[PDB]
Scaffold this motif. Structure first.
Motif, PDB file in Angstrom:
ATOM      1  N   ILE A  52      42.848  33.465  45.028  1.00 31.80           N
ATOM      2  CA  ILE A  52      41.752  34.354  45.425  1.00 31.80           C
ATOM      3  C   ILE A  52      40.440  33.757  44.973  1.00 31.80           C
ATOM      4  N   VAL A  87      39.984  42.464  49.155  1.00 31.64           N
ATOM      5  CA  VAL A  87      40.626  42.359  47.853  1.00 31.64           C
ATOM      6  C   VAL A  87      40.191  43.589  47.093  1.00 31.64           C
ATOM      7  N   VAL A 114      41.427  34.359  50.512  1.00 29.09           N
ATOM      8  CA  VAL A 114      42.758  34.531  49.936  1.00 29.09           C
ATOM      9  C   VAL A 114      43.705  33.545  50.601  1.00 29.09           C
ATOM     10  N   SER A 157      39.817  45.766  44.069  1.00 29.22           N
ATOM     11  CA  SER A 157      39.698  45.549  42.637  1.00 29.22           C
ATOM     12  C   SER A 157      39.976  46.842  41.879  1.00 29.22           C
ATOM     13  N   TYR A 209      41.388  39.111  38.267  1.00 31.16           N
ATOM     14  CA  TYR A 209      40.397  38.587  39.191  1.00 31.16           C
ATOM     15  C   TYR A 209      39.003  38.974  38.711  1.00 31.16           C
TER      16      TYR A 209
END
Length: 330
Positions: free
Chosen positions: A23, A106, A94, A108, A59
């Motif tokens: 990522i 993505v 990704v 979070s 991440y």
């Protein structure tokens, strides 16, 4: 294009499987639980409540030059097993096994439930069910597979899970060396957002095959095989001392047992789950009572062909205009 990534059991009992995912830019590699039963790609992150992170890799979008906050977007998901997570959303690059999607949502995590915190091996989930289940609001987002589809050589992915061993997720091609015999394809309903299909029946051990329609979902994100109570009772009746335990939360059996196999039908074809695949080990450390890998779906509201079943097969998730599922022995 295609991609190919190895998927690895998280522990000695195959309690779940993790697959590395890149990522951002530069890449941040997280080990995600590929889940054909849900449709959100969410990750532990630098935004996750600190007390809810225990050993997971996170991440950090601020360190990715390609991350962009998706303005106003939030997500919140509750899984069938009672777990949950929620947060905000970035788009970023990704990649899985060499296959790259730009602009992937993505999600979070700002909050995760205790079972996620307590599992240090899983850095998030990558949903592979249909995008109609994606929880991002106010603008629903597409799955990694949905985004990749147009670029893939063929609009498919395959799951080849190992028993107490690594396996493979492939995107965009069918590896004809990875299975024996032929792949039998069967119809899918997408009406509930799942890879939902109808098994043609079952057998227990060397017993006769019972022809009966069993509607259920192919769900790589569920560990066990959940089937109607009648079926499950017929299975455990063949194991001396097996019983359903309300206190433990399902069928348990003496760890000294040798388990019979379980066969399920895919059209006229048959997939055999060896008995050892159905052993999930002591209910607590040092116990001689072991947890069964086939459990009742009563009260779930749906039958679930989870990892116990899928790992006995090479499974094709065919995402053509009319989706289908394929199963082969291996």
């Amino acid at each position: 294009s295609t991609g190919s990534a190895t998927t690895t059991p998280i522990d000695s009992l195959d309690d779940a499987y993790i697959t590395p995912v890149q990522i951002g830019t530069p890449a941040q590699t997280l080990n995600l639980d590929f889940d054909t039963g849900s449709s959100d790609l969410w990750v532990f992150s630098s935004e996750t409540t600190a007390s809810e992170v225990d050993g997971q890799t996170i991440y950090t979008p601020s360190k990715s030059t390609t991350a962009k906050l998706l303005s106003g977007a939030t997500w919140s998901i509750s899984y069938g097993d009672g777990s949950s997570s929620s947060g905000d959303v970035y788009t970023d690059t990704v990649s899985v096994g060499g296959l790259t999607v730009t602009g992937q949502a993505v999600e979070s995590a700002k909050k995760v439930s205790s079972s996620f915190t307590e599992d240090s091996t899983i850095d998030g989930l990558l949903g592979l069910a249909f995008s109609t289940l994606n929880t991002v609001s106010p603008t629903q987002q597409k799955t990694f597979f949905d985004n990749a589809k147009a670029s893939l050589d063929s609009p498919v992915f395959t799951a080849d899970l190992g028993y107490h061993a690594p396996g493979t997720y492939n995107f965009g091609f069918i590896d004809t060396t990875a299975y024996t015999g032929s792949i039998t394809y069967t119809a899918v309903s997408t009406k509930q957002g799942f890879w939902e299909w109808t098994s043609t029946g079952y057998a227990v051990g060397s017993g006769t095959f019972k022809s009966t329609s069993i509607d259920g979902i192919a769900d790589t994100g569920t560990t066990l095989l959940y089937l109607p109570a009648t079926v499950v009772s017929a299975y455990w009746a063949q194991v001396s001392g097996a019983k359903s335990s309300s206190s433990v939360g399902g069928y348990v059996f003496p760890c000294s047992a040798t388990l019979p196999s379980f066969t399920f039908g895919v059209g006229s074809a048959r997939i055999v789950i060896p008995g050892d695949y159905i052993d999930f080990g002591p209910i607590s450390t040092g116990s001689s009572s072991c947890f069964g890998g086939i459990q009742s779906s009563a009260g779930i509201g749906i039958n679930i062909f989870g990892d116990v079943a899928l790992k006995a097969a090479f499974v094709v998730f065919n995402g053509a205009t009319t989706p289908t599922l394929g199963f082969a022995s291996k």
